[PDB]
Amino acid sequence: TPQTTDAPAFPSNRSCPYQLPDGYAQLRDTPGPLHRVTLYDGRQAWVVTKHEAARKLLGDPRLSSNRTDDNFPATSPAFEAVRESPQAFIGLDPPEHGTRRRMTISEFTVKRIKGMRPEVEEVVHGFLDEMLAAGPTADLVSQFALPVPSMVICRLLGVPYADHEFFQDASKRLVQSTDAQSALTARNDLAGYLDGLITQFQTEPGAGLVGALVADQLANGEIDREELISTAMLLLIAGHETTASMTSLSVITLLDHPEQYAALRADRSLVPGAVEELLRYLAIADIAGGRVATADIEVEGQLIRAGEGVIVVNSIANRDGTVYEDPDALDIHRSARHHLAFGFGVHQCLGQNLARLELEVILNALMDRVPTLRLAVPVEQLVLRPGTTIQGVNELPVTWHH
Template structure:
């Protein structure tokens, strides 16, 4: 009996996060988590233990019931990759806060991402998409979809919303990528410092002379009146700037790969562009690119699926597994653009649900039909096994995607 207990104590839970082997599928090792119930133990890169919430209903209940804390300065907050060590002690943006601080900051930003505001932006998004497709047609294939289209389209849109000069887009695209994909805490801190210094200068200029966009409004209405500290606006702007283009860029690129490798689904979309809205919802569910966004700390003792999670223990709500819960999504591993189920958790759930989800949906609904409609014969210019997914500790995606189009092989 004692030998059995000793063996159990020496056996570590499977690692989390893990790397994908296929850009549009969860890591093969996550199948082990799916078989163990709504909450299972995982092991982080530093050997520490973490609770993984994999069941859809448990995930929604925990994210909406005040059971979890998003406080990134809590000692129990899970650090899922070395790069996060470098930024955990920085002043947090509002996504790393709990109520009432989180509520106050989020309310300052909400109007810019409302359904009404995004609807008004659609003509702008359509123009940006068309301009980049025209440039691609002028250049001709093969080319890399990421720098030609996936990254600059959402980058220009978020510049429009924030009021960031688009002339600076190359700087913040490169620096935000260095932050998200840093190999060490030091690299992450360096990139965060460069972006923070840039935003400090921009906000200083906006305080001296009013300017457009979300930053201009907050500088004028909140910072100038002492209701928001300059460093708070910097951290919130940093979060919106990075999340506003990196995540959507990844979704555009992975959506193209997924549709190309499900030709019957792509043909259905081409035959009926009205399916775009439903297709986007299925792509969001199926791809689930933001597993690491579900990092939390237990705010109280919790019972999940017969497992006891103690207050202060690290928790990750694993969106990619919750979104493939067969009790909610029949045949969950099948990609079906007619499913169109908006109950997915690609944007999280509860008070921390993604602020920019309306914008992301609009960009995808516009970008994908335009790409496949205006680039007949769009296809990968390399075999899929040469397309390398990013590591599991960051926003899921690929850094390069060679494509071509037109006739020929």
């Protein structure tokens, strides 16, 4: 008897870095803002698959971000690590979301990001210096894509880059965790490290966001010590793991579209617009779209009930053809405005403009310093991370004219 279902398994895994999984193309192609899916443990949930309905639902305070709710949609057993408190503000609703978020925004302003450009350029060209001096073949991930945003986010936070071996290993173990025990261990490892850093700042006040939170909000009782740990850990992992994935997938994608990459090198004024298109097209943080309804929500004749899980799948929303004509075509010249790679609304990515800065500087540096850059293995041989985490590749063999 047939196996066809009306609530297919979710998430799906990419088989090409810049292509929707087959099941997601199916969801994109079916009319209506929502579709039922089956999560890993058999629970049904809703996915949002259309662009404006995704903006609307991201804007709806009845869809809560509280990951500790028992009805929050967990997409893998590893969710239990981040299901355990205290949540950073990414998992808070108004008004608590605002009080905590505002403790960090000063580090991510347009003015501050502008002020970081000389640092980002120096760090990028330093790791390129070292990689190009050693000659090919190199893994772009370990040699460049990951160290660059790690060094930058360390100075922003006041986390000593000398500890990068420890905290990068713990972050990777957390990001890649496929069961709760592995994820909790990695999280506990980072948590204890950050607790010791807090104690060091209480002895010796210091620079960086962590040092600022310790000396002010923590000392006034306005943030819990373990809330500070959760917030710093969010920013540290988002600050280097997510951006690193965006670099490697962008390089793969541009090399698979040689005409567009050549147009980009020939006119660097196109880089900001290319960055927006790559963000729309690669949408690497599908995993960040989970919500839980605290009240019934009517959506174009379909009803979300209080207690149901909803996942706003921004990658599928970003392929909405009513917003992006020929949505599966990479076009660095198109209008990629209003894309949802960073979300929308009160939770829109705090790091978005640092990510935009870093990708711009990195793309120009690679075109400047390594114009002969090419992959050292076929694209099909690369290993893509599954849909249960941030999209990316575990390694990226590259070569170039030595």
